[PDB]
Amino acid sequence: AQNPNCNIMIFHPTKEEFNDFDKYIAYMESQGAHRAGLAKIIPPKEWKARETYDNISEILIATPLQQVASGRAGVFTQYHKKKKAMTVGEYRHLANSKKYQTPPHQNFEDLERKYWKNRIYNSPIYGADISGSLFDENTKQWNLGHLGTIQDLLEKECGVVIEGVNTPYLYFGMWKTTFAWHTEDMDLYSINYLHLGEPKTWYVVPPEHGQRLERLARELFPGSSRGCGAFLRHKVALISPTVLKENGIPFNRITQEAGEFMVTFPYGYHAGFNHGFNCAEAINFATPRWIDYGKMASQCSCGEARVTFSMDAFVRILQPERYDLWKRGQD
Ligand SMILES: O=C(O)CNC(=O)C(=O)O
Ligand SMILES: [Mg+2]
Ligand code: NI
Ligand SMILES: [Zn+2]
Numbered sequence: 497a498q499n500p501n502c503n504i505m506i507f508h509p510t511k512e513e514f515n516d517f518d519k520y521i522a523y524m525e526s527q528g529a530h531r532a533g534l535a536k537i538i539p540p541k542e543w544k545a546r547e548t549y550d551n552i553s554e555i556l557i558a559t560p561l562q563q564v565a566s567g568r569a570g571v572f573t574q575y576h577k578k579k580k581a582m583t584v585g586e587y588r589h590l591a592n593s594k595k596y597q598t599p600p601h602q603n604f605e606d607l608e609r610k611y612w613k614n615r616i617y618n619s620p621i622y623g624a625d626i627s628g629s630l631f632d633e634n635t636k637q638w639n640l641g642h643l644g645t646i647q648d649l650l651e652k653e654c655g656v657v658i659e660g661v662n663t664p665y666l667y668f669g670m671w672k673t674t675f676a677w678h679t680e681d682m683d684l685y686s687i688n689y690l691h692l693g694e695p696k697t698w699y700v701v702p703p704e705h706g707q708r709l710e711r712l713a714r715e716l717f718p719g720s721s722r723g724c725g726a727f728l729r730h731k732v733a734l735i736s737p738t739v740l741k742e743n744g745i746p747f748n749r750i751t752q753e754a755g756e757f758m759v760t761f762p763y764g765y766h767a768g769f770n771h772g773f774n775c776a777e778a779i780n781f782a783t784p785r786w787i788d789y790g791k792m793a794s795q796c797s798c799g800e801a802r803v804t805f806s807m808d809a810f811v812r813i814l815q816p817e818r819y820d821l822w823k824r825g826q827d
Contacts, residue, residue, distance in 0.1 A: 499528025502702035504535065504748045511540040514637045518644070521685075521759070521783060530785075532748060533764025534700040537757040539638065545755075546632040549692045552775070553585030555666070557623035560587065563674055565616040570736035571716050572616050574674060579621060584668060584775075587623055591670035591773035596620060598671040598694065598772035604751050608697060611769050612736050615672050623668035630666065630691050630777055638757065640664045640689060640779045647806070649782040656813055660806030664779040669696070669770030676731045677709065677767040681803055682810045683793040684780040686760045688752070693774030696752045699737060703763040705746045709735075712743050729796035734767060762789035790814045797825035 499505065505527065509520055520537075529535040561576040582590070590596060601607040629641040636642075645662040671694075680686050690696060701709045710728065714721040717733055724730070740747050752758050754774070760766055762785070782790075791814045795801075803826075812819050 499531045502531040504532045504750050505529045506536040508538050511542045514540055530761040533702050533761050535759045555584040557582055557587055561622050562619045564619045569616055570739045572734050573732045587668050588773055596670050618672055620670050620672040622673040626666040628666050629664050640777050643781055646782040653784055653787050658809035660809050664777050667776045669774045671772045673770045675768050677728055677733050677765055678731045679763050679765055680780055681807055683763045683789040686778055686780050688758045688776055688778040690752050690754045690756055691775045692754050694772030696770050698768040699747055699749050701747045701765040706763050706765050708745050709765050724796055724798040726794040726796045729801040762786050795822050797821045799825050
């Protein structure tokens with residue numbers, strides 16, 4: 497068995513190996529990358545996502561979200577408070593202000609300590625889930641707006657044509673902006689490219705151990721757990737690495753820098769934070785190996801999780817017994 501300790505693997509494809517996306521994901525899996533739940537891909541030195549980032553200030557963040565925490569430093573939830581619209585230029589200025597800027601620090605490890613110690617006492621503002629792309633249309637390799645669609649994958653594997661579309665999303669982050677513990681919708685893969693700015697630290701639980709994290713979460717968030725059998729789908733709960741270690745939950749951590757891709761694998765729980773002003777792009781995707789995960793994915797039917805139009809067909813076709821109850825939660 498490849499990668500039996502479920503360590504996060506880092507890949508350095510050549511320009512020739514960067515041509516065929518599907519083939520390279522399958523190569524990474526042949527080496528056991530999926531066992532970690534997360535992999536890093538450093539693009540060949542010849543590659544670029546676009547020529548420059550000098551002209552992105554007029555992008556609009558229609559609904560910036562202030563991330564307000566409740567709980568204790570290591571075990572907290574966050575809610576999102578909607579703020580007034582601002583441009584990327586305005587947001588970048590805010591991120592760099594004395595109220596929100598990254599503090600002085602020695603290294604990534606010192607910054608991680610400061611995050612976990614102090615996150616709950618501040619409410620950073622995140623520009624999330626903005627439909628769009630920063631890849632140049634002429635970038636032919638690993639362009640997140642030109643991937644094969646999950647609808648076409650389900651049709652190729654299962655023979656059924658379905659409605660829906662699959663497009664990327666932009667994330668503009670600042671110091672302490674936070675992504676809560678989750679897997680993807682329908683336990684899909686995700687791919688994330690850090691276009692510019694400061695790093696993003698990730699934590700991940702190997703897929704084979706995801707139920708251990710779920711059990712701890714039910715213990716640590718007991719009201720939430722009573723309200724919904726799949727409440728991590730709400731994307732609001734944070735658990736620190738110190739707490740995970742104290743409770744014997746297997747996990748790994750890695751920092752992604754600008755110009756690097758991360759891939760999350762089916763049923764790989766992940767969480768993390770941004771180091772300072774940055775812009776990432778991400779999208780879900782599928783492979784043939786995903787289908788069995790899609791069939792078994794938990795669902796939130798309490799009404800909180802509320803998801804895209806395109807998840808309907810995945811539930812309908814892969815989870816027909818669940819469909820009626822899940823759709824009630826959507827309505
Ligand atoms: O970058 C973020 O805020 C969160 N991204 C992801 O969870 C992802 O790419 O799967
Ligand atoms: Mg612009
Ligand atoms: Ni994710
Ligand atoms: Zn729910």
